[PDB]
């Protein structure tokens, strides 16, 4: 895959450039399986109104991985921004 598609495949399938660069503080969602289960549902309550289907410790990891993988569409804040609660994510 040569051209702009190489750059596309890189960002689309690799951790964002500024995600593994030493930063002064952390920024993300850290909680036990029980709490993060509730927070994932709460994030979906603000995510369902615009397209995300409802998902009525493996389910939690699958849902978190799917949220993390979802890519940024232009300048719009990404899908995981509902859980992480920042627009710089």
């Amino acid at each position: 895959l040569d051209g702009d598609t190489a750059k596309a495949y890189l960002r689309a399938r690799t951790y964002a450039p500024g995600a593994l660069t030493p930063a002064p503080a952390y920024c993300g969602a850290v909680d036990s399986a029980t709490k993060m289960m509730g927070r994932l549902a709460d994030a979906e309550k603000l995510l369902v109104p615009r397209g995300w289907p409802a998902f009525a410790t493996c389910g939690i990891v699958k849902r978190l991985l799917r949220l993390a993988a979802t890519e940024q569409q232009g300048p719009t804040p990404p899908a995981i921004a509902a859980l992480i609660r920042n627009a710089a994510v």
């Binding site: 596309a8 495949y9 689309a12 615009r50 397209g51 995300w52 998902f55």
Partner: protein, 746 residues
């Protein structure tokens, strides 16, 4: 001693539908004429008709409908506060009702014509129109218009929509909303409706938080638009003096609403509020609150429209998008209104003839034809194609090919057969609906507005009378027979087509072009003349003289399925592809890729053994698939681009319980449901109705491992057709998507 005036009727609406005393099987209907004299000055007029039960059952097509049912529906529609949205119970009932009242208006009173000069009379002793006559003096005033924008947040409870959609599965979601308002009219009392009617004289804007409550923002007044008129009437049905309030539309004539986000519930609610406001004071009769549109039926409809069967009496035209040519579609809607008396597209196929008088005309047309076509009609089975064509796996070239079409052959043939059965009609005056179809056919080449009418009036008429299909397809079969007979004389060779449109080849040397034009033109002349001669011999006479269209000259032509044909003229590099489904925005890019791959693969006419060409063709086809899937990645996040338009007939994905929450977005869904298959979590692929969610959308990554598979499926169909049609057969072009380039998405 009858009064006489000079006016043009701008609209015809239904005020009252009553059952007089000592009556059992005939009901009277009062019609409101919005007449305007010269220089635009408008005086309101009224007429009465008398429709019998037999006529109702004729325009309905069945005897299930009765006079009592119609009068009960009209009485229910008398009050919009108690129950609006009356047509939603039996839409066919109101459709037939408008059809018969217009027919009786034409019969008893006389010939009527919107936006046209008309000498009108009246009887003061009773006070209604008595006779309408076509006039021949006056440059009638231009049909002025007013631009209307209306948006309302009718807080419909989602669960009711879900339940009503569960009762009838493939219910277009606008019908679900509309049924929700019908079952709970109080929901139409509370809505943040905003209205802005701009005219050429004065603007008018209102804003509401609750509809019944006084406005939270005013502009102009109701009186600037409307001139409320109280008119006394003495119908034959009502001996006592009956007074009617009407909303005379001063300044404007009809409404122009954008069809982009048109909400039939919005206009229904606004007009219900106006109805309540105007007819709040008693001492006068109340009109009919009836509206029809594609949103009023479970399965929906192709063409957006908003009928005004009663209150307020002003036609409202929805012109969907088309911003570049907005004036063109506004003029087309105005012409469609004026010609077909405003019944179209609400009344349906009954504009021409009652749905049940057709079984007689078709039989009366099977008799006046020639003896051969008489049987040819009777032996028509769906898709017979009794003509020498090409095997669907085949291709031709380099030979001089040409495509031909008769513009509007089904409509013209239907008109001629309707005239053949015209003598068989009960009423000679009941043939005026047979004058609108000739007006449509005559004006079809001149103006495209008649076109879209004829491409829907004809197929729907063929559904109203199933027996008309076997007649039309027999006449067209006869036309194709003489096309084939005349083809041999002019070196033309029938190779494929679908009747009115047919493509063929020429037995001329495939290098000379100076004489090519001559033969291509002589073939057109001879085929047109011979088909016209057969039609004349079959007694069928066309109003607009028949014309054959040279829709392109090409050198190579390849066909794979019955409808899939690709033509290419190497000299000018002009091509044409048909049979590839355009079921979304990605299918257009696929079609372009196919039309470039085929242009490159038939450019391989370099002298080679046929075996070599098959491989150097398959390689290029695989490379084209590669370049398509590579570009697919750069648009993987455009869900609207990876969207498919599912029809209300096709099997559809099940509606997510959150798509029932679109608010003023569920109303846009009339015909098509645009679905994108996304892949949440893993393994499971779920469908998202794209146009039922607010924008910008947030979704899990689009399952391109499903849409690209279907796009590729049809690409391999075309490529297997061309590979097995130009060179030796035996090769089913398959692209290993699951292995070569599956990783990109899944």
């Amino acid at each position: 001693d009858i009064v006489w005036v000079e006016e043009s009727v701008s609209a015809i609406t239904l005020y009252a539908v009553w059952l007089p005393p000592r009556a059992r099987e005939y009901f009277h209907a009062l019609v409101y004429f919005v007449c305007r004299n010269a220089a635009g000055e408008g005086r309101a007029r009224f007429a009465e008709v008398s429709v019998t039960a037999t006529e109702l059952r004729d325009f309905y097509g069945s005897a299930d409908v009765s006079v009592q049912a119609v009068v009960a529906a009209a009485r229910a529609a008398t009050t919009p506060a108690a129950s609006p949205l009356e047509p939603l119970e039996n839409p066919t009932l109101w459709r037939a009702l408008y059809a018969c009242v217009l027919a009786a208006l034409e019969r008893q009173t006389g010939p009527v014509a919107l936006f046209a000069p008309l000498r009108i009379g009246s009887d003061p002793r009773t006070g209604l129109v008595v006779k309408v006559e076509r006039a021949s003096w006056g440059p009638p005033a231009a049909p002025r218009a007013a631009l209307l924008v209306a948006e309302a947040n009718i807080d419909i409870d989602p669960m009711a929509l879900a339940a009503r959609v569960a009762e009838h599965p493939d219910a277009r979601l606008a019908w679900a909303r509309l049924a929700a308002i019908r079952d709970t009219p109080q929901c139409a009392s509370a809505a943040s409706l905003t209205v802005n009617i701009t005219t050429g004289t004065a603007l008018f804007a209102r804003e509401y938080q609750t509809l019944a409550f006084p406005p939270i923002k005013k502009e102009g007044a109701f009186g600037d638009l409307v001139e409320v008129c109280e008119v006394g009437l003495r119908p034959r049905g009502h001996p006592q003096r009956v007074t009617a309030r009407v909303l005379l539309p001063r300044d404007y004539d009809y409404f122009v609403s954008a069809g982009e986000k048109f909400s039939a519930p919005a206009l229904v609610a606004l007009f219900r509020q106006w109805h309540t406001t105007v007819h709040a004071a008693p001492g006068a009769l109340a009109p009919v609150f009836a509206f029809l549109g594609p949103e009023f039926e479970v399965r929906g409809g192709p063409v957006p429209y908003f009928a005004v069967l009663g209150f307020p009496g002003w036609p409202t035209f929805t012109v969907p998008a088309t911003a570049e040519s907005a004036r063109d579609l506004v003029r087309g809607a105005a012409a469609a209104y004026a010609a077909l008396l405003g019944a179209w597209p609400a009344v349906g196929a009954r504009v021409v003839l009652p749905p049940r008088a057709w079984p007689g005309v078709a039989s009366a047309a099977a008799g006046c034809l020639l003896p051969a076509v008489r049987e040819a009609v009777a032996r028509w089975h769906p898709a017979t194609k009794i003509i020498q064509l090409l095997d669907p796996p085949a291709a031709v070239g380099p030979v001089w090919t040409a495509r031909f079409c008769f513009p509007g052959l089904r409509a013209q043939l239907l008109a001629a057969l309707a005239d053949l059965g015209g003598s068989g009609l009960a009423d000679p005056h009941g043939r005026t609906g047979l004058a609108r179809l000739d007006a449509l056919v005559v004006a079809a080449p001149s103006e495209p507005w008649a076109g879209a009418v004829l491409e829907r009036l004809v197929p729907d008429t063929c559904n109203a009378c199933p027996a008309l299909r076997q007649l039309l397809g027999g006449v067209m079969a006869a036309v194709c027979l003489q096309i084939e007979e005349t083809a041999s004389s002019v070196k033309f060779a029938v190779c494929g087509g679908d009747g009115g449109a047919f493509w063929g080849v020429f037995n001329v040397d495939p290098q000379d072009a100076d004489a090519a034009s001559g033969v291509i033109e002589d073939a057109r002349r001879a085929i047109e003349t011979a088909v016209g001669a057969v039609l004349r011999a079959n007694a069928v006479r066309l109003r607009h003289p028949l014309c054959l269209a040279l829709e392109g000259v090409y050198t190579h032509a390849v066909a794979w399925s019955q409808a899939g044909v690709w033509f290419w003229n190497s000299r000018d590099n002009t091509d044409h592809l048909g049979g590839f489904p355009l079921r979304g925005p990605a299918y257009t890019t696929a079609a372009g890729v196919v039309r470039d791959t085929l242009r490159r693969v038939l450019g391989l006419t370099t002298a080679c053994v046929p075996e070599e060409d098959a491989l150097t063709a398959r390689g290029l086809m695989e490379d084209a698939c590669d370049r398509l899937i590579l570009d697919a990645f750069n648009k993987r996040l455009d869900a609207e681009y990876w969207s498919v338009r599912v029809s209300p007939f096709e099997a559809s994905d099940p509606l997510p319980p959150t798509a029932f929450r679109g608010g003023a977005l569920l109303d846009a869904e009339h015909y098509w449901r645009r679905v994108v298959r996304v892949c949440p979590g893993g393994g499971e692929s779920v469908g998202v109705p794209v146009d039922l969610y607010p924008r910008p959308l947030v979704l899990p990554p689009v399952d391109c491992a499903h849409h690209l598979r279907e796009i590729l499926r049809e690409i391999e169909l075309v490529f297997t057709g061309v590979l097995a049609g130009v060179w030796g057969e035996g090769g089913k072009f398959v692209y290993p998507f699951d292995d070569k380039m599956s990783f990109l998405f899944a």
